Scaffold this active site. Structure first.
Site, mmCIF file in Angstrom:
data_model
loop_
_atom_site.group_PDB
_atom_site.id
_atom_site.type_symbol
_atom_site.label_atom_id
_atom_site.label_comp_id
_atom_site.label_asym_id
_atom_site.label_seq_id
_atom_site.Cartn_x
_atom_site.Cartn_y
_atom_site.Cartn_z
ATOM 1 N N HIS A 78 84.120 53.511 64.494
ATOM 2 C CA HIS A 78 85.447 53.204 65.062
ATOM 3 C C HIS A 78 85.652 51.702 65.309
ATOM 4 O O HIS A 78 86.742 51.197 65.063
ATOM 5 C CB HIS A 78 85.769 54.044 66.324
ATOM 6 C CG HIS A 78 85.562 55.526 66.139
ATOM 7 N ND1 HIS A 78 85.485 56.382 67.221
ATOM 8 C CD2 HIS A 78 85.456 56.256 65.007
ATOM 9 C CE1 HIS A 78 85.267 57.580 66.718
ATOM 10 N NE2 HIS A 78 85.217 57.549 65.393
ATOM 11 N N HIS A 235 92.180 60.780 61.761
ATOM 12 C CA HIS A 235 90.922 60.267 62.333
ATOM 13 C C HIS A 235 89.852 60.196 61.240
ATOM 14 O O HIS A 235 89.048 59.261 61.237
ATOM 15 C CB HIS A 235 90.394 61.074 63.528
ATOM 16 C CG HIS A 235 89.196 60.400 64.151
ATOM 17 N ND1 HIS A 235 89.335 59.237 64.908
ATOM 18 C CD2 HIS A 235 87.875 60.633 63.956
ATOM 19 C CE1 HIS A 235 88.101 58.855 65.213
ATOM 20 N NE2 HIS A 235 87.188 59.650 64.645
ATOM 21 N N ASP A 239 87.684 56.951 60.206
ATOM 22 C CA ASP A 239 86.234 56.959 59.964
ATOM 23 C C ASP A 239 85.880 56.395 58.582
ATOM 24 O O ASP A 239 84.998 55.561 58.488
ATOM 25 C CB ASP A 239 85.673 58.383 60.067
ATOM 26 C CG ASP A 239 85.547 58.969 61.451
ATOM 27 O OD1 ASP A 239 85.568 58.185 62.438
ATOM 28 O OD2 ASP A 239 85.394 60.218 61.554
ATOM 29 N N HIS A 262 80.442 60.942 57.239
ATOM 30 C CA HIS A 262 79.626 59.718 57.237
ATOM 31 C C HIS A 262 78.557 59.672 56.151
ATOM 32 O O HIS A 262 78.410 58.633 55.508
ATOM 33 C CB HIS A 262 78.995 59.453 58.620
ATOM 34 C CG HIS A 262 79.976 59.580 59.737
ATOM 35 N ND1 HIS A 262 81.074 58.730 59.842
ATOM 36 C CD2 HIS A 262 80.040 60.504 60.721
ATOM 37 C CE1 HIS A 262 81.742 59.141 60.911
ATOM 38 N NE2 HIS A 262 81.159 60.203 61.473
#
Ligand SMILES: CC#CCOc1ccc(C(=O)N[C@H](C(=O)NO)C(C)(C)N)cc1
Ligand SMILES: [Zn+2]
Length: 297
Positions: A78, A235, A239, A262
């Site tokens: 973030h 969101h 990311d 991720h």
């Protein structure tokens, strides 16, 4: 020329790690030309520096974690998304603990703290990485792709079998829509049922309605509801912007995510880095010609 940028002044923030639940001090310091983003763990003796680069990504389980030996910096995504959105090339990031503070769960407080202090343009060209050909990584039903595109665009698709999951696909073109207005405020999210299992594993210890969208069995628990109708997928875009910034230079291309996270974001970066014919480092002498525009400092 499109110049490199750093911070005009040192800025400070206090918070808690989303996963560790530990109180942490965050300090962002101006840095010289070609430094990049470098994390500095000030609670360690000696102090440890970890450059924010794809090669230093150690763990990708819940958040993007940077590693250097037995030292880590958790949940960098973030803060890095805010730095990428604002075009910050150089900065020292000092932390008093192993996890970046979660703040309100979005990039919003970081964007504001940076814009409060202000940006300093530096007398050196900003280096961009142009996507020259398609690069992709797949694992099961998950996919992460880079496609050549003259600007910067992020497309994402999530697929949750839950009643709360609304628009599950979104595409943001940074030539048409600003990072600040459309993406920065999108908060992280968690499912109440998972939080139980996560806390037994010493994860999500600092999570609450104050720093995350908390989803119950049939609805959003947060009193005030959502910031955007498609806040969940926005969101996921936030990311990806942060994870992609670990390349160390701003991308000129399109990112497409299909149920990715991720781990696959880092795998895509690793594949792009290895595929040197797929990319080239470029500078722009004229900002009027440039495919990516940044706000005035
Ligand atoms: C009470 C309470 C509570 C909140 O609890 C959690 C727990 C986990 C997360 C999390 O893993 N989020 C991830 C993220 O944004 N990584 O950047 C995401 C969305 C990609 N999986 C978020 C909040
Ligand atoms: Zn996140």
């Amino acid at each position: 020329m499109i110049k490199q940028r750093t911070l005009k002044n040192i800025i400070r923030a206090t918070g808690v790690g989303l996963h560790s639940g530990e109180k942490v001090y965050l300090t962002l310091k101006p840095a010289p030309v070609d430094t990049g983003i470098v994390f500095c763990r000030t609670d360690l003796d000696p102090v440890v520096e970890i450059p924010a680069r794809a090669e230093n990504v150690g763990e990708t389980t819940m958040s993007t974690t940077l590693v250097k030996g037995d030292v880590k910096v958790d949940t960098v995504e973030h803060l890095l998304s805010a730095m990428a959105g604002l075009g910050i090339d150089n900065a020292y990031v000092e932390l008093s603990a192993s996890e970046v503070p979660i703040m309100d769960g979005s990039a919003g407080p970081f964007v504001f703290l940076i814009q409060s202090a202000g940006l300093q343009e530096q007398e050196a060209a900003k280096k961009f990485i142009r996507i020259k050909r398609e690069v992709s990584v797949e694992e099961g039903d998950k996919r992460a792709v880079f496609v050549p595109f003259d600007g910067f665009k992020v497309s994402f698709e999530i697929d949750f079998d839950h009643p709360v999951f609304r628009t599950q696909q979104a595409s943001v073109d940074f030539s048409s829509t600003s990072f600040v207005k459309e993406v920065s405020r999108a908060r992280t999210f968690g499912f109440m049922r998972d939080i139980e299992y996560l806390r037994s594993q010493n994860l999500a210890l600092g999570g609450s309605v104050e720093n995350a969208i908390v989803v119950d069995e049939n609805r959003v628990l947060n009193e005030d509801g959502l910031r955007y109708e498609d806040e969940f997928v926005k969101h996921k875009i936030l990311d990806a912007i942060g994870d992609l910034y670990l390349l160390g230079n701003s991308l000129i291309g399109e990112f497409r995510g299909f149920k990715s996270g991720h781990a696959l974001n880092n795998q895509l970066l690793r594949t792009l880095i290895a595929d040197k014919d797929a990319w080239e480092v470029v500078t722009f002498e004229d900002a009027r010609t440039a495919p990516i525009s940044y706000m005035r400092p």
